[PDB]
Design a protein around this ligand. Structure first.
Ligand code: JLQ
Ligand code: HEC
Ligand code: HEC
Ligand code: HEC
Ligand code: HEC
Ligand code: EL6
Ligand code: SF4
Ligand code: SF4
Ligand code: SF4
Ligand code: F3S
Lengths: 164, 121, 110, 55, 103, 951
């Protein structure tokens, strides 16, 4: 039973490390650091705001493959805890009284696309400083790529049309 | 001389394991059932060494023991101690040297000697 | 069993990097808290989770499927080439406690 | 160590919601508040045909 | 070495010559057995001989046949396993144009 | 008992936004060797830097990198880096220093800052320069006083003599058919080294279509990498080069002075002059930094006469902030310290006590100064004698900006938050300017914003360069009278001493780094040690060794006898010689260098450090005390008595000549143009009597006709023996660093090795040949056939596969390998107890344990990743193509080489670069008489000799 190279000295992806304070060899992103050949110049792609306001516009044209990718991403992440059809009827809501929002309500029909992008990026609303406050939607910035987030917004538009 | 051969082979059999660098993995050269499905190469000459030395040691030991079986019978008869007897006697295997035991013994010794000459070369 | 078979959550919601890299992303406490900030809050069996996400300390899961760091497996190519975590892992959908379905022998892979 | 046999899940599960929603997403129909449904993949085709504003 | 190995100066074998001695020994022993059958009746080969000399010559022929095979195999394995361009041609010539069938 | 331990797994609490787990990322940052920035692309496995590469869009780093940039990873992970602020060697806090600094500066505000003094190195960062200028504005009487041991003082001095203004000289080697080098190493690491190496190599690379090749003439005291890649080399004494330059100007007709010279030197002068005037505007003259300012002024004058200016030599506005004579500024500071005028000294790095010349006695004068503050990144000898030592952030973990020799203004980007904290130089300047607790990111961003704009900052981070900033081209006016009216000092005062920066350790900053110390030094192959380098004749006369030294000289007929005599002449290496220069004795062991000039000794700086980390704590003999301010790079008189007492010096090669074997092929260019295969057609006529060798094999092999096949071509003409590839392999494949004792026992572990063969007539002036050797990936491999457990087997592509887990350690494979490229772990070389070293190891490659063999794996991890990616793309498309691009896979050695000698690609794809190179007439494989059929092949060296010097 050699156990020779079974556990090597190198640090793998999630191997715990005693060298760091928080016990993680994996490190958080240094602030203000951009990967190589990844320019962040376009504001629309990374934020639905053009002047601090929503636009009801989408940075790149809608494509059938784009809508299919949006449908896939919606089914993986968005469908649970909000309904596959967008009516908010999900098994999560039953066990917990989540009460997710309904896409087909008139308010979300007139909401801009960039509003959907903002909601997916950050959440419904951060808690009020006074009297407490909790984040319900809770945001999905890290898990989903911006282009995928725009595809999800396009799929939400398609879903809203589907019931009209 | 044959005792010298056995002891020299015993001394020389340690070096293939000692020089191995990872000495506890000597069994890898020998074909053995494993969950990996790996085999020795059999085209290198160290794989041949494993079969030659192992065959040489076993054949030399069996030939030496066969020669000692009649000698053990004389020792058990002259042992003069009940405990010393029954130790040579089990090794003798009740030799009871007799015709129809010698005839097979002589033929077997000639055959073993005939097989050993190509083996040592 | 509860989250997949009853609550109905996709595999890629938690193991998000399975089809893109060699590593199936073990969920962060962020994904745990997106439901349990409201559901089953103030529960003694979700205390460790709530202990995280307040301090930076991680949750030390015990690795069930372990390879001896000279094997270099890749989920991405496998999944993309038409192989799923049922002929490759087991019915994890109905697994209250995950167990190793088979020993990862060299012969099994071959 | 014999392979464990976990106890089956309870009566209520997510499958009913998903199946009902997947049935609703196609086969047209009439919603209560509005007029008419549109099958999924048909509304998506309509969305590409009319397009969305850019920039 | 002078009579046969020098036919192709590019190739040399150290075991060569020892192989010829084994080949010569087998040929002479086989020749002696053929002659003995012819001279089995000769009077001095009648009151002074027994099966034991014939048996010993037969054992010697068997030993020489195995010895010649060992020397020939030993040269082949060393040249084949050590694939050096210098010693490869002799085997290539003896395995081509139907020479393989003779081997 | 169980197969393995629990192996707990710890995940994140909040996922990084742009990171996919298990997928490495690449970030653009800048690494500076002489204060001049070189753009680098660094792989971040999981938020930790692991592999440095080159930035294709950065001028002076087009893919290629120098060894110093490669070996920065192990420096960032040195377990001896400073971790805390020390008041007087006792741990303290940054806040306490900030309070003290503020009190000291407000106590110096009564005066105008007359006591406050600075001491930095060559600073090219615009942010730091602006902050220093603002600080000087706040304190009128403060002084900057830059200094660093390896500086460009002579270059700016010659510029201010020729033009009356500091300019920046740039060389465009792509359009120079003739290049002349007066003791200048442009192919050795320095400003613009990668850019110069790539342009020079491209001209040298010759195919059947090519009709033109560049020619290099080099005059130098010590043989060097630039000398190796030269058609003609003259070993003149270092002092004589100034006289040689004056003579060259005189025969060209430009102002100079006739100088008496040796007949060989006069013949070299005639050839150089005749080659010039035949290539006007197609020639360049380069003068080394070591050479005196008059040599630089003459070089500008010669270039102007030939009209080369504007075609091969370009003048730009100075890029190094304020250019100055650094040695004179340090002399001014030491006199002020002796007087006691200085009350505060702040030093940003540079290790002044160790680096400063011995005559200055900086350490004794440093004691007089009441407060001395040092930012070093290590507790150096200066920090030990300095109050308030402050840890400095490593460039990889710090926010910063730097300028290249051309002028680029590239931005340094942190890949990790500082491991032990520490403060950047700009943060120290901010505290002096009265703003404490100022973030490095804000300081650099604030300066850059409004100059390039926020959008420019985003583009600058994504790329490795700032497009807006470059040095403007200016046309200076040459002052004929000043250059003509110069002394031009004559050479000759007895034995001379030449001071050269160490090839692997530079100025001694990299002495702690294990990879660089273990690296064999090019042309001397020494490891972990410093030796005096002298020609065989110099050693015989000075140390009284009993050898004729004329026996080495001879024709081709007695070449084998002369090679044996050189081996007998060796074994005297390591005799200790006591050398007295100017009141200083070094007692350094001597190593014989055949190409060295007579009556000259080369001593390498960067050794003998006492406060360095556990690695290189006390290695070699310090040459800094003997070195003098008046003559930093040259020496006039040395006693060089022999004390016997031989000391062991360890070298990797152990043999200096090829024993009449076809290892290196050398041919003329004119013959090559008529027939590319002439070099291969020859040799076979001497050996077999026929142009083509009819090799015959009894073993079939595998077809490989329709599958990807991986092969490498190395160009002998391009290689300069830099050794960057060896460092790149060590970082990429996690090769262990063995100790000096293990190297002495010949157990060094290097997958790639460079061999110097020193084969020529005379052998006192031999032609150095550098050949990179790595596993040849032989289609029929002897090592595979002798392996009992089948650890080494072939691959479908054609790659030899070495499986460490299968290897039982028999060592039969190394014995049957003809090229001896296999390295075995006799003892546990890998470091298991050091956390920082564990972070450095690359996850893709396994860390080998004791008892397993290692060999070059053609960077299999890169090939496997490309194969998986190509298959994944094909299945998603549905094509099932599995097509891999020619540029998709680049080996670490291929990326590292500045010249571009190493090319890796599919052999079967006839459009690939390797396929085209392998179809050349001068391509060949080593030891063809063995039917190994290697895949790594070499291109025979083609030279371009002038008919004057040669015929
Ligand atoms: C093609 C033609 C054949 C050419 C053959 C050439 C090679 C022949 C080699 C023979 C070597 C013999 C060495 C001499 C041995 C010896 O002295 O003989 C002693 C005996 C016993 O006879 P006793 O009692 O002394 O007197 C007889 C008269 N009354 O005879 C023996 O041969 C047995 C002794 C042991 C044999 C030793 C030789 C073994 C050689 C092995 C190496 C072979 C290399 C491949
Ligand atoms: C869809 C049915 C799947 C499949 C096939 C797997 N998961 Fe998960 N998983 C989650 C967490 C937090 C863990 C670690 C805790 C634990 O192991 O009990 C896991 C673990 C696994 C494993 C084993 C990991 C190992 O180291 O071997 C496997 C093979 C696995 N999962 C497959 C989280 C979730 C999750 C909620 C976010 C859901 C949904 C899934 N996993 C779904 C699946
Ligand atoms: C991140 C990997 C986690 C972890 C560690 C857990 N969950 Fe969930 N969870 C969800 C729902 C709807 C339930 C049941 C609600 C109910 O029982 O009333 C749960 C339950 C759990 C438990 C059991 C708690 C208990 O029995 O009291 C545990 C230990 C648990 N979870 C751990 C919903 C989600 C969800 C989607 C909204 C996601 C994502 C998670 N849970 C994630 C996690
Ligand atoms: C359970 C964790 C949810 C997941 C999964 C998704 N959403 Fe959600 N969403 C959730 C809640 C509880 C609410 C209502 C919050 C409230 O204060 O009422 C929402 C709301 C939205 C909205 C409306 C936002 C608004 O300002 O009105 C949108 C547009 C929305 N959710 C979209 C959305 C998408 C795209 C999701 C997949 C990425 C998604 N939700 C998942 C809870 C949850
Ligand atoms: C081939 C059999 C598969 C397939 C198709 C999937 N899994 Fe994975 N899995 C498998 C092995 C051999 C391992 C061990 C990896 C190691 O380094 O030891 C794993 C591991 C996981 C893990 C643990 C986290 C990790 O190793 O990255 C998770 C989580 C996991 N597998 C999940 C998973 C998912 C969601 C899959 C998609 C259906 C999946 N596996 C497929 C073997 C295989
Ligand atoms: C036959 C004798 C063969 C030589 C002895 C080999 C013993 C090797 C055991 C090494 C593993 C070990 O000691 O670690 C402790 C282990 C968990 O604890 C163990 O598993 C101890 C195993 C003992 C094996 C005894 C075999 C009989
Ligand atoms: S170069 Fe040596 S190790 Fe590499 S394949 Fe050839 S014989 Fe084997
Ligand atoms: S190909 Fe890779 S392993 Fe081989 S020498 Fe180059 S860097 Fe080292
Ligand atoms: S092959 Fe290696 S030593 Fe030669 S020039 Fe390239 S990097 Fe330098
Ligand atoms: S012979 Fe084989 S066992 Fe290892 S040391 Fe060589 S690969």
């Amino acid at each position: 039973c050699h156990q020779d190279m079974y556990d090597q000295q190198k640090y793998t992806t999630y191997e715990p490390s005693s060298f760091f304070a928080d016990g993680r060899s994996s490190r958080p992103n240094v602030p203000g650091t951009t990967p190589f050949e990844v320019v962040k110049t376009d504001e629309f792609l990374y934020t639905g705001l053009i002047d601090g306001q929503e636009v009801d516009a989408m940075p790149f044209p809608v494509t059938k493959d784009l809508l299919l990718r949006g449908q896939l991403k919606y089914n993986i992440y968005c469908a649970v805890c909000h309904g596959e059809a967008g009516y908010g009827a999900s098994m999560v809501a039953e066990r917990g009284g989540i009460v997710p929002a309904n896409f087909h309500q008139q308010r979300l029909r007139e909401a801009p696309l960039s509003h959907f992008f903002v909601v997916i990026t950050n959440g419904v609303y951060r808690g009020d400083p006074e009297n407490g406050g909790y984040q319900s939607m809770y945001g999905y910035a890290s898990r989903i790529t911006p282009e995928d987030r725009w595809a999800i917004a396009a799929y939400i538009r398609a879903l809203q049309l589907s019931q009209n | 001389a044959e005792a010298m051969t056995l002891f020299a082979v015993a001394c020389a059999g340690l070096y293939p394991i000692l020089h191995l660098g990872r000495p506890w993995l000597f069994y890898w050269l020998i074909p053995y059932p494993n969950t990996h499905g790996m085999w020795p190469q059999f085209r290198s000459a160290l794989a041949w060494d494993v079969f030659a030395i192992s065959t040489y040691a076993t054949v030399s030991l069996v030939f030496w023991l066969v020669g000692l079986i009649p000698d053990f019978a004389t020792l058990r008869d002259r042992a003069k101690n009940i405990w010393v007897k029954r130790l040579y006697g089990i090794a003798a295997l009740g030799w009871r040297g007799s015709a129809r035991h010698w005839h097979r013994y002589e033929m077997a010794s000639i055959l073993l000697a005939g097989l050993s000459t190509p083996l040592v070369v | 069993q509860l989250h997949v078979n009853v609550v109905g959550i996709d595999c890629r919601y938690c193991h998000t990097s399975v089809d893109q890299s060699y590593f199936a992303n073990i969920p962060a406490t962020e994904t745990c808290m997106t439901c349990h900030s409201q559901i089953k809050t103030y529960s003694p069996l979700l205390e460790k989770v709530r202990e995280s996400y307040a301090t930076g300390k991680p949750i030390e899961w015990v690795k069930v499927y372990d390879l001896p760091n000279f094997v270099y497996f890749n989920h991405s190519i496998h999944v993309n080439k038409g192989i799923g975590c049922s002929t490759c892992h087991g019915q994890v959908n109905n697994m209250p406690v995950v167990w190793q379905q088979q020993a990862l022998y060299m012969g099994w892979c071959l | 160590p014999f392979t464990p046999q976990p106890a089956p899940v309870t009566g209520n599960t997510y499958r009913t919601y998903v199946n009902d929603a997947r049935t609703l997403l196609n086969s047209y129909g009439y919603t209560m508040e509005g007029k008419v449904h549109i099958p999924i993949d048909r509304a998506m085709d309509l969305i590409v045909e009319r397009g969305l504003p850019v920039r | 070495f002078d009579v046969a190995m020098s036919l192709d100066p590019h190739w040399f074998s150290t075991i060569y010559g020892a192989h010829y001695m084994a080949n010569a020994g087998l040929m002479t022993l086989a020749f002696l057995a053929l002659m003995m059958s012819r001279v089995r009746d000769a009077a001095l080969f009648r009151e002074y001989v027994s099966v034991k000399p014939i048996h010993d010559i037969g054992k010697l022929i068997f030993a020489f046949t195995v010895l010649w095979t060992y020397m020939s195999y030993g040269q082949l394995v060393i040249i084949w396993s050590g694939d050096v361009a210098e010693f490869t041609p002799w085997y290539v010539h003896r395995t081509q144009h139907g020479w393989v069938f003779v081997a | 008992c169980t197969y393995q331990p629990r192996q707990y797994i710890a995940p994140f609490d909040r996922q990084p936004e742009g990171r996919v787990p298990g997928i490495p990322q690449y970030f653009a940052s800048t690494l500076t060797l002489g204060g001049y920035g070189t753009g680098v692309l660094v792989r971040s496995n999981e938020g930790r830097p692991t592999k440095v590469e080159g930035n294709p869009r950065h001028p002076a780093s087009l893919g290629g990198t120098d060894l110093f940039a490669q070996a920065e990873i192990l420096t960032m992970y040195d377990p001896d880096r400073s971790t805390t602020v020390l008041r007087q060697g006792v741990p303290s806090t940054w806040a306490e220093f900030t309070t003290t600094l503020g009190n000291a500066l407000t106590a110096a505000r009564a005066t105008q800052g007359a006591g406050v003094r600075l001491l930095t190195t060559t600073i090219t960062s615009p942010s730091l320069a602006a902050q220093i200028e603002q600080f000087l504005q706040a304190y009128p009487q403060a002084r900057w006083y830059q200094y660093e041991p390896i500086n460009r003082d002579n270059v700016v001095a010659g510029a201010r003599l020729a033009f009356g203004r500091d300019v920046t000289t740039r060389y465009d080697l792509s359009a120079a058919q003739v290049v002349v080098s007066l003791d200048a190493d442009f192919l050795a690491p320095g400003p613009g080294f990668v850019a110069y190496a790539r342009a020079f190599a491209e001209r040298r690379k010759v195919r059947k279509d090519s009709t033109t090749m560049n020619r290099l003439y080099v005059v130098e005291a010590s043989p060097s990498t630039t000398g190796t890649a030269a058609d003609h080399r003259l070993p003149l004494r270092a002092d004589a080069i100034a006289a040689f330059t004056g003579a060259l100007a005189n025969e060209l007709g430009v102002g100079g002075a006739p100088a008496t010279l040796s007949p060989k030197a006069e013949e070299f002068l005639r050839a150089i002059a005749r080659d010039l005037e035949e290539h006007r505007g197609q020639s360049v003259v380069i003068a080394g930094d070591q050479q005196p300012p008059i040599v630089h002024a003459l070089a500008h004058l010669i270039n102007a006469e030939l009209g080369n200016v504007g075609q091969t030599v370009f003048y730009h506005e100075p890029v190094e902030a304020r250019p100055t004579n650094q040695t004179e500024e340090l002399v001014a500071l030491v006199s002020e310290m002796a007087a006691g005028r200085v009350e505060t000294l702040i030093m940003i790095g540079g290790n002044p006590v160790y680096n400063a010349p011995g005559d200055l006695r900086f350490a004794d004068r440093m004691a007089s100064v009441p407060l001395t503050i040092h930012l070093s990144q290590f507790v150096d000898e200066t920090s030990a004698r300095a109050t308030w030592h402050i840890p400095q952030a490593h460039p990889l973990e710090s926010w910063g900006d730097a300028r290249a020799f051309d002028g680029t203004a590239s931005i340094v980007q942190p890949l990790i938050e500082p491991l032990y904290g520490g403060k950047t130089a700009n943060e120290l300047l901010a505290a002096m300017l009265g703003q404490p607790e100022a973030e490095s990111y804000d300081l650099v961003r604030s300066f850059w914003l409004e100059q390039i704009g926020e959008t420019g900052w985003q583009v600058a981070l994504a790329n490795g360069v700032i497009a807006e900033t470059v040095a403007p081209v200016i046309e200076p006016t040459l002052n004929e009278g000043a250059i003509r009216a110069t002394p031009i000092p004559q050479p000759g005062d007895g034995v001379e001493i030449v001071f050269r920066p160490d090839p692997s350790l530079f100025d001694g900053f990299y002495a702690n780094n294990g990879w660089l110390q273990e690296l064999p030094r090019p042309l001397t192959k020494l490891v972990w040690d410093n030796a005096a380098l002298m020609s065989p004749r110099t050693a015989i006369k000075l140390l009284g060794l009993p050898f004729n030294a004329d026996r080495l000289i001879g024709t081709e007929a007695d070449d084998r006898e002369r090679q044996q005599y050189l081996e007998q002449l060796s074994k005297v290496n390591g005799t200790i010689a006591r050398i007295e220069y100017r009141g200083g004795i070094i007692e350094i062991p001597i190593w014989l260098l055949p190409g060295h000039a007579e009556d000259s000794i080369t001593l390498n700086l960067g050794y003998g450090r006492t406060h360095a980390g556990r690695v290189g704590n006390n290695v070699g003999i310090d040459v800094y005390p003997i070195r003098t301010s008046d003559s930093p790079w040259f020496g006039a008189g040395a006693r060089v008595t022999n004390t016997g007492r031989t000391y062991l010096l360890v070298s990797t090669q152990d043999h200096w000549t090829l024993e009449g074997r076809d290892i290196y092929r050398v041919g003329e260019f004119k013959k090559f143009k008529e027939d590319p295969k002439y070099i291969a057609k020859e040799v076979y006529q001497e050996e077999y009597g026929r142009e083509t060798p009819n090799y015959q094999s009894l073993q079939p092999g595998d077809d490989y006709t329709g599958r990807n096949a991986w092969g490498m071509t190395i160009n002998l003409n391009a290689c300069i023996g830099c050794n960057a590839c060896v460092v790149a392999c060590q970082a990429e494949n996690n090769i262990a660093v063995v100790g000096k004792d293990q190297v002495s026992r010949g157990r060094e572990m290097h997958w790639i090795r460079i061999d110097r063969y020193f084969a020529g007539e005379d052998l006192d002036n031999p032609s150095i040949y550098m050949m990179p050797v790595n596993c040849m990936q032989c289609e029929k491999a002897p090592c595979e056939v002798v392996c009992p457990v089948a650890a080494t087997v072939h691959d479908y592509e054609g790659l030899n596969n070495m499986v460490y887990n299968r290897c039982v350690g028999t060592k039969y494979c190394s014995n049957n390998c003809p090229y001896k490229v296999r390295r075995f772990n006799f003892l546990q070389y890998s470091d298991t107890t050091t956390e920082t070293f564990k972070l450095a190891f690359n996850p893709d490659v396994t860390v080998r344990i004791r008892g397993v063999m290692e060999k070059c794996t053609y960077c299999v991890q890169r090939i496997s990743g490309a194969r998986i990616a190509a298959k994944r793309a094909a299945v998603q498309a549905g094509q099932s193509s599995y097509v891999i691009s020619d540029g998709a896979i680049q080996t670490a050695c291929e990326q590292a080489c500045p010249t571009g000698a190493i090319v890796f690609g599919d052999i079967n794809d006839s459009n690939s670069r390797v396929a085209k190179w392998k179809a050349e007439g001068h391509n060949y494989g080593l030891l063809g008489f063995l039917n190994t059929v290697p895949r790594t092949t070499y291109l025979a060296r083609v030279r371009n000799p002038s008919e004057e010097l040669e015929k």
